[PDB]
Amino acid sequence: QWALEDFEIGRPLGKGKFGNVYLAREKQSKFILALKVLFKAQLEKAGVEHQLRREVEIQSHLRHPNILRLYGYFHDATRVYLILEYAPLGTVYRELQKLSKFDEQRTATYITELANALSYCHSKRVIHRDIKPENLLLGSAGELKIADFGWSVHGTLDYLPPEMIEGRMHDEKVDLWSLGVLCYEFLVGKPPFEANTYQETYKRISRVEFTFPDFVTEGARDLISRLLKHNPSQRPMLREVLEHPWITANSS
Ligand SMILES: Nc1ncnc2c1ncn2[C@@H]1O[C@H](COP(=O)(O)OP(=O)(O)CP(=O)(O)O)[C@@H](O)[C@H]1O
Secondary structure (H helix, E strand, O other): OOOHHHEEEEEEEEEOOOOEEEEEEEOOOOOEEEEEEEEOHHHHOOOOHHHHHHHHHHHHOOOOOOEOOEEEEEEOOOEEEEEEOOOOOOEHHHHHHHHOOOOHHHHHHHHHHHHHHHHHHHHOOOOOOOOOHHHEEEOOOOOEEEOOOOOOOOOOOOOOOHHHHOOOOOOOHHHHHHHHHHHHHHHHOOOOOOOOOHHHHHHHHHHOOOOOOOOOOHHHHHHHHHHOOOOHHHOOOHHHHHOOHHHHHHOO
């Protein structure tokens, strides 16, 4: 379909696992996009050549103002290139280092943008493992865009919920956990179950051992508490998140 020839490639936007993401421009149209290079090599030799074909396909056909568009793809000798919407304000990760914590307005805002993006994603039966802040890009007006592609129906642990590490059966509730983690991390500046070892983060996640710094408000504590429940069934539905004294008081 497309080829390396169709694009002027520019500066590096960052390094991924299996290659880098370049800034690029389609020549006939001068459309500005991102162009993700993944080497066939470290997909062959990591057992994922299968895995991405599925994520692409899932991604290939879903569309939402807060989900990163995949436009298309192609390949050459030993490289595969994906073709992405380009997010100019980078990752929420950098925004979080640059700022350390987020105020309640922006935090509630991002959680709204996410719930939406996710409830739409629920409406078509899709889900999310790698739902973490380095996988959250910011668009030209300042809005979230999920950029991790994420699965349908069957690693650092900070963002995994209990059900996925104790090896159990797991459903859309997984995303509810992620929002609690993401919410906590936006406000506090670090994930609720952070540790220095994989093996402690497990106990910490398994039991749901987290505490709040003094500066975190009764209303946030409540939402985060509702979201971070060991039993998945006990966690809310996304509409209850959206309509929540706190979210509602603080979003845009
Ligand atoms: N579409 C885009 N627009 C702007 N910047 C992007 C982008 N895609 C990627 N980047 C930048 O390049 C980095 C590497 O890409 P990406 O994060 O997708 O790699 P990756 O999936 O292999 C590892 P992970 O998903 O865990 O971060 C991103 O963290 C981001 O800084």
